[PDB]
Design a protein around this ligand. Sequence first.
Ligand SMILES: Nc1ncnc2c1ncn2[C@@H]1O[C@H](COP(=O)(O)OP(=O)(O)OC[C@H]2O[C@H](O)[C@H](O)[C@@H]2O)[C@@H](O)[C@H]1O
Ligand SMILES: Nc1ncnc2c1ncn2[C@@H]1O[C@H](COP(=O)(O)OP(=O)(O)OC[C@H]2O[C@H](O)[C@H](O)[C@@H]2O)[C@@H](O)[C@H]1O
Ligand SMILES: Oc1ccc(/C=C\c2cc(O)cc(O)c2)cc1
Ligand SMILES: Oc1ccc(/C=C\c2cc(O)cc(O)c2)cc1
Ligand SMILES: [Cl-]
Ligand SMILES: [Cl-]
Ligand SMILES: [Cl-]
Ligand SMILES: [Cl-]
Ligand SMILES: [Cl-]
Ligand SMILES: [Cl-]
Ligand SMILES: [Zn+2]
Ligand SMILES: [Zn+2]
Lengths: 277, 282
Amino acid sequence: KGKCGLPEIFDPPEELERKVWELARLVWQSSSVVFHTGAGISTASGIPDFRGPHGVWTMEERGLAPKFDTTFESARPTQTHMALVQLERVGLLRFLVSQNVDGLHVRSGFPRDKLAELHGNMFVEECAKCKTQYVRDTVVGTMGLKATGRLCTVACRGELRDTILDWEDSLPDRDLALADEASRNADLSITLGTSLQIRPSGNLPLATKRRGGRLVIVNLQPTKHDRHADLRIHGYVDEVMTRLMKHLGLEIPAWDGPRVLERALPPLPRPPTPKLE
Amino acid sequence: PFTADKGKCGLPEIFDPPEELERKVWELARLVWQSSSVVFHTGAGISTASGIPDFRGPHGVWTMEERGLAPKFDTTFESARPTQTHMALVQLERVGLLRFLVSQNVDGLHVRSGFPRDKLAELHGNMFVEECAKCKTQYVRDTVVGTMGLKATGRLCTVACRGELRDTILDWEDSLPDRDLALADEASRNADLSITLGTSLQIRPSGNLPLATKRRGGRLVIVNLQPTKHDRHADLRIHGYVDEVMTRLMKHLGLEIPAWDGPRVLERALPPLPRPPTPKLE
Ligand SMILES: Nc1ncnc2c1ncn2[C@@H]1O[C@H](COP(=O)(O)OP(=O)(O)OC[C@H]2O[C@H](O)[C@H](O)[C@@H]2O)[C@@H](O)[C@H]1O
Ligand SMILES: Nc1ncnc2c1ncn2[C@@H]1O[C@H](COP(=O)(O)OP(=O)(O)OC[C@H]2O[C@H](O)[C@H](O)[C@@H]2O)[C@@H](O)[C@H]1O
Ligand SMILES: Oc1ccc(/C=C\c2cc(O)cc(O)c2)cc1
Ligand SMILES: Oc1ccc(/C=C\c2cc(O)cc(O)c2)cc1
Ligand SMILES: [Cl-]
Ligand SMILES: [Cl-]
Ligand SMILES: [Cl-]
Ligand SMILES: [Cl-]
Ligand SMILES: [Cl-]
Ligand SMILES: [Cl-]
Ligand SMILES: [Zn+2]
Ligand SMILES: [Zn+2]
């Protein structure tokens, strides 16, 4: 279960402020920006992470229990989830790679054709026969790609299965392939609340480094790949992302409740870019 | 500070099965529709879903301290967003279904949600609020006032005064603010419905205010994951996440939960907005 319960790092405010301006600078200059997210971007909605001070695995190692302040169904997308919605909407996010099974990116209204859900989604079941996916309003009741008890309704009666990978299960080929292509082709990869400890998910941001790409890591704890980052920001991702959006001249949009967007809409207008050099 | 009785910490959580939860939220809807004067009492449990830990929960400040462990914050107080529950309370006031709001929370989230300060009793103070010792003018800051226990913050009153500004955060020995307690008590006594949300009700007198509503035939509803001091006196106890309860409630009452435009201070309640017609009940 990897390195659990590592101490947190807090950049002092002055340093925190300068690094967020540097991130702004990087977003403005990059043609292709890919965001990698993990459990840390949902901690501010009451969903514990895995390896943080009170993470699932960290609490288990100490003979304690993780604490949920929400159900998966009653969780609201964080300020960070909604910033990513807007960043995609105005063309500043090329693609979004997530390790999270908590369903919050989809329910935020983030376009599924710009999202790799590497470890699956608790609300998503898949027909074994035709591979048609169903995005449900409640958590699918099983994990480990098991029979849910429901049947495909495609004009098929195929066995529906959860999309939650067990330890032995290889990542979905479609999601990993698009995630890998996005990462290789990106000139900026930004990581938000992941420790980058899982192979290959944790390694995707490193692929951006190939052919001169830039890596930014936003995380309260040290990550597996700190050494490879051009910029490491140690603070709460919500604070980092609200400062970034303010610098970029972008509103964080209202969440109208759980909404599924299959396909990315045409790009909205965005502010003009500052002079940088 | 050190010997201070911190009460019953870390009691087991109780979860109503979904059918019972759904039935009880419909009963709560029935009570709200029938009540002339509805008063909400909130504590630390309504902020857990924004990453601020409570005091007496499984992972609360005092519970964790008892076991030699630390509470965990997933936000700063300045970056915390009001929960679905905070914003539901905003709307319930706006459509005239909330008479008054009594809070033990120092986390600044009611004010910052845009809830009107003239319908809010902040019994234990507010981390973002400093007060002039000379003229009692309050200042609602964008960042936390850096001191606790009614201490000198280092800033001076700007009223057309130069009075010493002090934090509004009570220490253990400090009595409640007289204005906030007085209005909270009056609200509570005169209410025919008190709804408690995410408080264990263990603090005197804050936790006792909801019992005052029971006087002259009032009804008490307690929403809480743990047992509370006054469970025996409740007409209705709901054991679930306050966000689930309040979203289902708003749905039943035909109310949208409004957008948070970011931290906004409202000094005075605005005129009442339209609300849905009431169902036939009896
Ligand atoms: N608000 C916050 N702001 C910034 N960082 C945060 C915050 N909250 C927590 N963190 C950090 O966020 C980091 C979360 O790292 P991990 O807990 O490993 O989550 P993963 O998504 O990378 O786990 C990958 C898979 O492993 C599992 O087996 C599952 O299959 C997962 O899908 C921590 O370092 C915190 O310091
Ligand atoms: N999401 C949730 N949904 C429902 N209940 C919840 C949730 N999260 C927590 N709870 C419950 O929320 C309850 C929180 O109770 P306590 O932790 O005693 O907070 P207080 O506000 O009453 O503390 C009063 C004062 O004492 C202090 O010294 C300070 O002065 C405080 O101002 C728990 O029983 C949880 O089960
Ligand atoms: O890979 C995984 C598959 C299933 C789960 C299950 C629950 C869970 C627990 C958390 O604290 C966060 C989360 O998002 C989900 C977790 C990881
Ligand atoms: O009465 C009080 C005075 C000061 C404080 C300080 C911090 C604090 C800790 C929490 O976990 C929640 C909260 O809202 C505030 C807490 C209570
Ligand atoms: Cl526990
Ligand atoms: Cl739990
Ligand atoms: Cl759930
Ligand atoms: Cl701890
Ligand atoms: Cl803070
Ligand atoms: Cl209004
Ligand atoms: Zn099928
Ligand atoms: Zn003054």
